[PDB]
Amino acid sequence: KQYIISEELISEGKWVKLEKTTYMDPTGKTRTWESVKRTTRKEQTADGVAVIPVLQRTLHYECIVLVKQFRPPMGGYCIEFPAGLIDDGETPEAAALRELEEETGYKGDIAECSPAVCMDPGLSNCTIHIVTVTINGDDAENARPKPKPGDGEFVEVISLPKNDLLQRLDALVAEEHLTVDARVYSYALALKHA
Amino acid sequence: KQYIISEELISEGKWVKLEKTTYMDPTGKTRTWESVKRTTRKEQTADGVAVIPVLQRTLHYECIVLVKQFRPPMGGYCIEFPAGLIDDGETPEAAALRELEEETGYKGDIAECSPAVCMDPGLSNCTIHIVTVTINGDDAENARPKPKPGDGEFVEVISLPKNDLLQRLDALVAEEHLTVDARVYSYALALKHAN
Numbered sequence: 001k002q003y004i005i006s007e008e009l010i011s012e013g014k015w016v017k018l019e020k021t022t023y024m025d026p027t028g029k030t031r032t033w034e035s036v037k038r039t040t041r042k043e044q045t046a047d048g049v050a051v052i053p054v055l056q057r058t059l060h061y062e063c064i065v066l067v068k069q070f071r072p073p074m075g076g077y078c079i080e081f082p083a084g085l086i087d088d089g090e091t092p093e094a095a096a097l098r099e100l101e102e103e104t105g106y107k108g109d110i111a112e113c114s115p116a117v118c119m120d121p122g123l124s125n126c127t128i129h130i131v132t133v134t135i136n137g138d139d140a141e142n143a144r145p146k147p148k149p150g151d152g153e154f155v156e157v158i159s160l161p162k163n164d165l166l167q168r169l170d171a172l173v174a175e176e177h178l179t180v181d182a183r184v185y186s187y188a189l190a191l192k193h194a
Numbered sequence: 195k196q197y198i199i200s201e202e203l204i205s206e207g208k209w210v211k212l213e214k215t216t217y218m219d220p221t222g223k224t225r226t227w228e229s230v231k232r233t234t235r236k237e238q239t240a241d242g243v244a245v246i247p248v249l250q251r252t253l254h255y256e257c258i259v260l261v262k263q264f265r266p267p268m269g270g271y272c273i274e275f276p277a278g279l280i281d282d283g284e285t286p287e288a289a290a291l292r293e294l295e296e297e298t299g300y301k302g303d304i305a306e307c308s309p310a311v312c313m314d315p316g317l318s319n320c321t322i323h324i325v326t327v328t329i330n331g332d333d334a335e336n337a338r339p340k341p342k343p344g345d346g347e348f349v350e351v352i353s354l355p356k357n358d359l360l361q362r363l364d365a366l367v368a369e370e371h372l373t374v375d376a377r378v379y380s381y382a383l384a385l386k387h388a389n
């Protein structure tokens with residue numbers, strides 16, 4: 001029953017805009033909503049990618065590779081899956097492998113790619129592909145990985161055992177002022193719940 | 195090594211505002227960031243809660259209870275953990291049981307509660323507590339559960355088996371043209387990856 005009637009631009013930055021969304025509610029009544037959108041979305045099936053990078057090495061427990069960065073919106077450091085926006089013309093998979101290498105130094109192998117999933121659908125239209133990638137940590141290039149961070153981008157790599165992920169995230173939250181991402185935390189919870 | 199120098203208000207609506215953040219990059223170079231905030235955060239731990247509701251009925255598969263709603267920013271229907279903003283002075287646990295009952299009619303028990311976790315930290319300062327709740331589906335109060343929607347809420351309940359969650363979500367996307375929430379999808383992946 002529900003659908004968009006109009007989208008009025010309220011304020012447009014270089015990267016983010018605020019819109020007034022007019023929609024039909026299911027009783028047949030017109031209602032509005034304050035919506036956030038990115039200015040950067042062209043023909044990409046999503047704004048960005050998040051990478052679930054499973055680091056595999058013989059006689060090691062599998063690790064999940066995470067990154068720690070300063071996030072201006074948060075006024076603080078956050079622990080996240082490696083992630084970035086999809087370049088114009090770029091596939092989710094190439095964006096995932098490219099961002100994983102830039103942020104971590106690791107060269108991954110694609111495992112699976114989600115459909116477009118919503119980041120905060122009450123707030124924004126922002127979507128990602130969640131791309132699962134395995135990293136062969138026995139391969140030469142994955143021996144001493146060097147992040148190739150872009151301009152301003154400063155990332156720290158944190159590799160945590162998959163078999164203890166939630167406890168290791170809790171011990172990082174206990175020991176420093178830093179926020180875990182909700183996708184990282186949901187993934188760590190499901191590893192426990194399984 | 196990095197920190198906020200100043201925040202400039204660009205546009206303030208009723209629910210959301212757009213800010214320009216000035217911050218010190220780790221070189222000592224000053225840089226700007228376009229950031230989104232809610233106007234509704236007060237003394238709360240986080241803006242909202244999301245509930246992972248584990249529906250436990252004997253002789254049935256354990257189910258994760260999800261909600262489908264029209265999301266105006268998405269322009270489409272989304273499948274999500276039940277969720278809402280924490281009322282001023284409401285605790286995350288209490289917000290979790292309230293939101294779960296309003297959205298699904300189920301009455302549940304707190305299993306665990308996350309610290310505040312960020313929703314989209316490149317975009318916004320928005321945070322939630324993820325609250326794992328068990329629901330005794332065999333108890334009388336959860337027999338014919340009464341979803342109590344607030345004004346302007348219109349929520350469909352979708353319970354999917356935990357042991358098949360990711361495949362069930364992929365089926366819904368393929369057939370129903372829904373968007374799955376990133377946290378729901380992340381949970382569903384880890385259930386598969388735990389193997």
Ligand SMILES: O=c1[nH]cnc2cccc(F)c12
Nearest residue numbers: 032033034035122123209210
């Ligand atoms: O317009 C909104 N935008 C974002 N979040 C909301 C949360 C509650 C009610 C609202 F109208 C809104």
Ligand SMILES: O=c1[nH]cnc2cccc(F)c12
Nearest residue numbers: 015016226227228229316317
């Ligand atoms: O200012 C920004 N705000 C949000 N997202 C961004 C993504 C890339 C580069 C940027 F400066 C921004």
Ligand SMILES: [Cl-]
Nearest residue numbers: 193248305326
């Ligand atoms: Cl549980």
Ligand SMILES: [Mg+2]
Nearest residue numbers: 082083084103
């Ligand atoms: Mg990134």
Ligand SMILES: [Mg+2]
Nearest residue numbers: 083084099103
């Ligand atoms: Mg990047």
Ligand SMILES: [Mg+2]
Nearest residue numbers: 276277278297
């Ligand atoms: Mg809600």
Ligand SMILES: [Mg+2]
Nearest residue numbers: 278296344347
């Ligand atoms: Mg509500």
